[PDB]
């Protein structure tokens, strides 16, 4: 059983940006001591929903300060940055950490990113798809060239080479059937949402496995992750209150981030990304989600997670603890998860 720690770098209104940044640093360093193998970093721009916009650079820092700890992105917003620059960053992380970087990717949730960085959210799926091929071509061959509909550039030598054969291991944040299939066609592990239930998780997996098997992948050796909002407390109802209050704030912060440019001048500057635009546009609250998350007593946490393991065969459990209050109360929540939940989870029979 592997354990991950999710770090959101969420800014509650009573904390300063400096204090939130110190907590990222500290919580990353505390993680190994609490029995976590991996720290996963979320990307977000411009708003308090999350203050870390560059997980490659924050991963560099934590990997630099550590030896055996793995650090991953959950997730890089793939489309909003140049695929060759990102390949350089991944290889560098891969080289410097000697193989401890985990490369989680998504299409991106917020238009504001596409707006500022100058690319098209309506095209996010095709960009994620194309950027992935170019990166993996660089990881595999040591060179990348593009002559397509989305982007074109001459062949270049990609520096440095990949430490890990085929590049650092890729994970896909996926929660549509189409992103599931995309990941499956590639044999790539998914990081599953903490807002869906066991039945939904199992159905997403069954879908994945169908396509993955057709390609010849061993579906039993793929490092899929269950992700979780987590609040372990001997007082069950206090854990639920803490998480219910947090999920309300974070959801409001998600909403605010979707509306940030709501009444603004839509004028774009120079188009450095010409092939990336499409002519046309494309054609839910989480207040009760603590019920389907390990929020409650250790025993209750054990049962929710074992139920997910038993339905999916996943043995990589990634938990977010930042709903839990001060740095001290987050660490204490991690420590109680470590002592009273970790040792009692078992792999699917």
């Amino acid at each position: 059983m592997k354990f991950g720690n999710f770090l959101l770098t969420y800014q509650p209104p009573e904390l300063s940006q400096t204090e939130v940044m110190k907590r990222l640093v500290n919580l990353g360093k505390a993680s190994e001591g609490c029995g976590f193998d991996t720290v996963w970093l979320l990307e977000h721009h411009f708003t308090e929903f999350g203050l870390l916009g560059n997980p490659y650079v924050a991963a560099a820092h934590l990997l630099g300060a550590t030896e055996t700890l793995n650090v991953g992105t959950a997730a890089i917003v793939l489309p909003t940055a140049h695929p060759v620059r990102q390949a350089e960053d991944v290889n560098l992380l891969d080289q410097m950490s000697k193989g401890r970087f985990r490369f989680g990717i998504c299409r991106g949730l917020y238009d504001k990113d596409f707006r500022v960085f100058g690319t098209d959210m309506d095209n996010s799926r095709a960009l994620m798809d194309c950027w992935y091929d170019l990166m993996k071509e660089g990881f595999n061959e040591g060179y990348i060239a593009a002559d397509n509909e989305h982007i074109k550039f001459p062949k270049i030598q990609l520096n440095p080479s990949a430490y890990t054969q085929g590049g650092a291991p890729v994970y896909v944040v996926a929660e549509s059937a189409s992103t599931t299939e995309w990941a499956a066609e590639r044999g790539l592990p998914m990081i599953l949402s903490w807002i869906i239930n066991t039945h939904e998780k199992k159905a997403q997996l069954d879908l994945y496995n169908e396509v993955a098997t057709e390609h010849g992948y061993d579906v039993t050796k793929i490092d899929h992750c269950l992700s979780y909002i987590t609040s372990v407390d001997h007082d069950s109802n206090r854990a639920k209150d803490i998480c219910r209050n947090f999920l309300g704030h974070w959801y409001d912060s998600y909403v605010n981030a979707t509306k940030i440019f709501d009444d603004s001048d839509q004028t774009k500057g120079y188009d450095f990304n010409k092939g990336q635009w499409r002519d046309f546009v494309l054609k839910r609250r989480i207040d009760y989600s603590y019920e389907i998350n390990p929020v409650g007593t250790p025993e209750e946490c054990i049962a929710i997670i074992q139920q997910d393991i038993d339905a999916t065969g996943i043995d990589n459990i990634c938990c977010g603890f930042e709903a839990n209050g001060s740095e001290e109360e987050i660490i204490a929540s991690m420590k109680l998860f470590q002592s009273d939940v970790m040792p009692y989870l078992k792999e699917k029979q």
Binding site: F46, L52, A81, V116, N159
Partner: protein
């Protein structure tokens, strides 16, 4: 004078990119308890002459593994890059290290890189200025809001806000008279480059001082930097032969339009290369020409690691 190290991270057929990155990390670890004050990282793309294209990412790693040295980008190329990414990253580094990052930046030196990243060469200098303007607005206020021909998007908080009031300390690569003048008017420190001639670096130093005077900018407390290569061997002819081989592809890549032998000869006599005596004398001359208050040195052309450390120690000691 403060003294530091920089990393070019050149590779070749027997010295893989894997190997040189490992070398740099070991070197960072070695010098961190010494009196060198800065570790600086060179940016290069698509060739053997530098395997680091993302000096801010490398900076994060170095900062995570070290405790004493400041860590700098040497020449982060802003002209080809999104300035929101740059500002975000440099502020993140500022914040994660609590103020141990210094932001060295550069205009683009290869037009091939401009084309690669679709930045028009006809307007390279105004693009550079606008990129720096956005980065500096973000460093100084936490916000930016461009409305120009290069970048136009709504007002944004650039997160995280800098840990250091005013943002991380900045310096700019002395790459053209136009850039040198721009910097002088802003009161920004320069880095002079190891691969420029002494005459060139002197010309830039003088231009700077004069533009500053003409404009009423107090530059009396501006600390310029110089970079130099160091290769010291009691066999001085061996030091020159080793640096020759190390430098050859570079001179062919970056000075293709200039005479090979004359330029090689100049790099070898003007850099801190040769016997200890020859080496330190070239350093004195190089500093006198440009007026740099801080010296950054690369020792990487010395292939024998134990020899390299011995020269780092001797240099540290005086």
């Amino acid at each position: 004078m403060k003294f530091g190290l920089f990393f070019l991270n050149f590779m070749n057929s027997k010295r893989s990119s894997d190997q040189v990155i490992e070398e740099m990390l070991d070197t960072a670890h070695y010098v961190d308890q010494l009196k060198f004050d800065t570790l600086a990282v060179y940016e290069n793309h698509f060739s053997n002459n530098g395997v680091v294209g993302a000096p801010l990412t490398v900076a994060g790693f170095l900062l995570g593994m070290t405790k004493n040295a400041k860590v700098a980008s040497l020449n982060h190329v802003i002209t080809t890059h999104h300035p929101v990414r740059v500002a975000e990253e440099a502020c993140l580094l500022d914040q994660m290290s609590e103020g141990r990052f210094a932001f060295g930046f550069s205009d683009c030196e290869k037009s091939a890189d401009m084309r690669f990243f679709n930045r028009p060469t006809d307007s390279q200098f105004q693009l550079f200025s606008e990129c720096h303007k956005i980065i500096n607005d973000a460093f100084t206020t936490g916000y930016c809001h461009p409305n120009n021909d290069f970048y136009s998007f709504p007002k944004i908080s650039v997160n995280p806000h800098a840990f250091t009031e005013g943002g991380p300390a900045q310096f700019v690569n002395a790459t053209s008279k136009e850039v040198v003048e721009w910097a002088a008017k802003l009161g920004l420190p320069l880095v002079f480059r190891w691969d420029d001639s002494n005459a060139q670096r002197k010309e830039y130093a003088g231009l700077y001082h004069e533009v500053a005077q003409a404009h009423g900018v107090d530059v009396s407390q501006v600390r310029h930097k110089l970079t130099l290569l160091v290769n010291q061997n009691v066999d001085g002819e061996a030091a020159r032969a080793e640096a020759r081989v190390y430098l050859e592809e570079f001179v062919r890549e970056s000075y293709s339009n200039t005479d090979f032998e004359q330029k090689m000869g100049e790099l070898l006599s003007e850099n801190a290369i040769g016997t200890y005596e020859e080496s330190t004398q070239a350093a004195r001359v190089a500093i006198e020409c440009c007026g740099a208050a801080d010296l950054l040195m690369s020792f990487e052309s010395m292939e024998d690691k134990a020899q390299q450390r011995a020269v780092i120690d001797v240099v540290n000691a005086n």
